[PDB]
């Protein structure tokens, strides 16, 4: 309601109108970077000045019926002119407030939770003072996941986090990676944040390497403790310790009814064809498969048609 009304009056002004009309989706990221280039007016001093005044934080309406206006001492926690609140409200919430189960946290931040387990189950040796030479090679800071490349990691992330906004590939193949099943089953009712979950999943699932001047261990577990192991003239020894087949026929037809969403293709029929919205705006006509259409040796059998 609000978004469509805000879009309506944006069409009244022409200067924005050809911007909307002449810009394809693929060029959106080109537009997004025309914002600004000058903001750093001594941020530390600004923060110090803002922390001196009362009500420096912004919050939503509902905090009015979850936190009292005054505490036992007699100090105001929020004021009416989003509403303005003070850090005393945050401390009060940390002291008195509703409690919820935190069972999903270890399953999302597990890549951080493995580091402490590695560290506190460790032992140290002696330190040696000498001179040494450090060489360079490719080092893996994120090990990633085996049996998974960079192409399908993004596919898994999109399938798990944004099931309704996938299109073309992942929608026409006839398969299902195993890890997707467990990832969907475990996060059945996780309500932390889509973006945070996506970022953590990419961090713990996608591998990436860099260049470092390391003169010690090469494995990934020896990289995050590089600041503790090496030095200018000293060396410390340490051990870690421890979705069916679909094909598109064309664009939307006006004789086949309104288009439907990805999650509403489950019902379908035994061969009906219908319009569907896929990707970031595409609308195509699809209809399921009466055969296999696989990638087996048949593709090579075309060699029988040549070189007789």
């Amino acid at each position: 309601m609000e978004r469509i009304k805000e879009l309506r009056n944006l069409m009244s002004q022409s200067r924005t109108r050809e911007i909307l009309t002449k810009t394809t989706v693929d060029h959106m990221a080109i537009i997004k970077k025309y914002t600004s280039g000058r903001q750093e007016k001594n941020p530390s001093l600004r923060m110090k000045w803002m922390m001196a005044m009362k009500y420096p934080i912004t919050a939503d309406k509902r905090i009015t019926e979850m936190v009292p206006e005054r505490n036992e001492q007699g100090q105001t926690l929020w004021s009416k002119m989003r509403v303005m609140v003070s850090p005393l409200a945050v401390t009060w919430w940390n002291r008195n407030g509703p409690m919820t189960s935190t069972v999903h946290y270890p399953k999302v931040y597990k890549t951080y939770f493995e580091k402490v387990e590695r560290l506190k189950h460790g032992t140290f040796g002696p330190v040696h003072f000498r001179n040494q030479v450090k060489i360079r090679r490719r080092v893996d800071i994120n090990p990633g996941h085996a049996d998974l490349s960079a192409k399908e990691a993004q596919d898994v992330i999109m399938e798990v986090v944004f099931p309704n906004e996938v299109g073309a590939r992942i929608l026409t193949s006839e398969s299902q990676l195993t890890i997707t099943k467990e990832k969907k089953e475990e996060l059945q009712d996780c309500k932390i944040s889509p973006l945070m979950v996506a970022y953590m999943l990419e961090r713990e699932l996608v591998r990436k390497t860099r260049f470092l001047p390391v003169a010690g261990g090469t494995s990934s577990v020896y990289i995050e403790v590089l600041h503790l192991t090496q030095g200018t003239c000293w060396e410390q020894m340490y051990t870690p310790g421890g979705r069916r087949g679909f094909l598109i026929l064309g664009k939307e037809d006006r004789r086949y009814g309104p288009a439907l969403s990805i999650n509403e293709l489950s019902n379908l029929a035994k061969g009906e064809k219908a319009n569907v919205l896929i990707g970031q705006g595409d609308v195509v006509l699809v209809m399921k498969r009466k055969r296999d259409s696989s990638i087996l040796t048949d593709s090579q059998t075309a060699t029988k048609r040549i070189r007789m």
């Binding site: 001179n131 026409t172 009466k290 296999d292």
Partner: protein, 712 residues
Amino acid sequence: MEDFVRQCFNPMIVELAEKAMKEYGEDLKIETNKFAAICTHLEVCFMYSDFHFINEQGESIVVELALLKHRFEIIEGRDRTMAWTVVNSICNTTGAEKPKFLPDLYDYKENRFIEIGVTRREVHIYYLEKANKIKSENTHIHIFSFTGEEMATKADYTLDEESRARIKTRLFTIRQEMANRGLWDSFRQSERGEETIEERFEITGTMRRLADQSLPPNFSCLENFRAYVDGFEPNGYIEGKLSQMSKEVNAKIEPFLKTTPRPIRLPDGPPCFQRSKFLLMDALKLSIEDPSHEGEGIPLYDAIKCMRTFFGWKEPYIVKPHEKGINPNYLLSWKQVLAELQDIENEEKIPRTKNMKKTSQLKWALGENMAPEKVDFDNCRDVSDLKQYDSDEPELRSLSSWIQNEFNKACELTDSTWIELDEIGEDVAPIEYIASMRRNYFTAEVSHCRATEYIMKGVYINTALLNASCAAMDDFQLIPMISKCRTKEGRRKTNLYGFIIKGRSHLRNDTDVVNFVSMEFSLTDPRLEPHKWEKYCVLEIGDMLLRSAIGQMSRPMFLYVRTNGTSKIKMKWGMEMRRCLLQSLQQIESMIEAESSVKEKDMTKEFFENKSETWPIGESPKGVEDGSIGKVCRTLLAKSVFNSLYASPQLEGFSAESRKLLLVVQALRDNLEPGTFDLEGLYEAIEECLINDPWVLLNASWFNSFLTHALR
């Protein structure tokens, strides 16, 4: 890109495209779009005629996994010769005529040729070129697209929906995952009709004319220069040019011996004067004597409570004129400060800050009436007595003996703490133990130094002045000078130094200046060194009782008044003085590590707890003296503080040139046979970076004193 094509299509399609390129006479590195176009065309052609057969009864069926007609024969997998031969054979056995170009495929069901096309633009325009290229003959044309479009002649697509859907989905997927990696734009903007062009770029105009005279003098056209460059072979040019150069161009080395260096020349003239923001060696404090542990109030009330603890005020009077200005204005300013501090009680409500009344003497002191007026040049073109600006050669001043006294006093120990750092986590690794003991020793040695007091004073004063300037912009606010410390037995103490009166502050940028006047207490008689105080006015204001020894003796009390104005940037510069401790710790640790790198073991023990080791950091008519590690640590801290408090480009230049000279001297002392090319210019640089600053003069004297001992 090549790798995308390698990883996308199966090899069987791949070897044929390479053979086609070799037959055409092209390359795969220079052009790549044509490779993708040929691969896509071949893939579409092979997919269009697969899993299709016709029964003996004439009907066509689709089967998977006996001897039936294939209903299609491939021509595109063969080069021109046998393609023409098979086309001739089939048209002879069927009675067909030679169309013109090479068709794509042949269908037995309809007994007619088919051509297949794939386009990157839309189908409607691309259809017409094929339609008017082949006319008045029987040849079907089918055109696909990368976005789901398709079109054939007479709208009779002789194929079921499933195969067309497969082809369209393959095209949609290849386009979709091509555009993701960043290759779709160049591929789309590469079809100029029915050919493929990599790129295009021409000069063609004003750029050509501009490039014409951007060449060596013996050329007129860019093409001729390019042709000359392309056919270049080096025969003898460098040696021939070198053989005919005069011998006065040379770099001769003169040896550097122990009798070569000479002392640096210092300027001569009138003595220098103090120009610091707050005086350092001649300051006292009015202690508040251990306020309550729950007391946290406004600095104005703390200053008032500090003031009420002193009795002995008298009639103030001038003891040293400023010789430039009016001293009765200073007297009236001090009296007004006292009166407006005393007259607080005539108010029904107690204020938080004090705004001074705008009086004539205060206005003169703050310079609010000496503002020049700005008008356009047009009206005042005919006026006389007009000069460019204050472009005057700087005066020359000599070196006095008070900066050395200040430096000597700055390295002593006090009876207070002046600094308390917070805690960190417990240590486990041995390197953590080594770092902890190093930093604990360093902190213990330099905790009670005077430089820490100077740092705290500067930080507090600058922060308070910046806050006052940012808060009030059109008022004459009174700003006290307040510091805090801890006593030996463990009681918090607050000290008051003086007062600062601020003018008008309307700062839009970081360069605008704000004026103020400062008044400070002291016990030092100015009549011993009149030349040191040249920008100050000194008053006698009272008498002080001293409890030293038995009895009570009285000494006069003096007030120093000065007018100044610093900057907005330099307030930020003064708020960061805690970094000097970090720099000194870094220097000490660097020396420790450098020494430990040779004797390959840990040297943190032989440096601190050893008491038989001495370092030469002193001088006397006897010779060179020695000191302990704490003394050198305090010396380094004081040097860092004084470097912070006396910034100037002369310091940078002198530091650079002296570093070069010291490196040369050290190389000489190591028996490495050093040498120079021009020893003089380094010197004239050293003297030309020696104009006025007393700190730089003291550094130059220190360098001379080091030189007179380093080679003797």
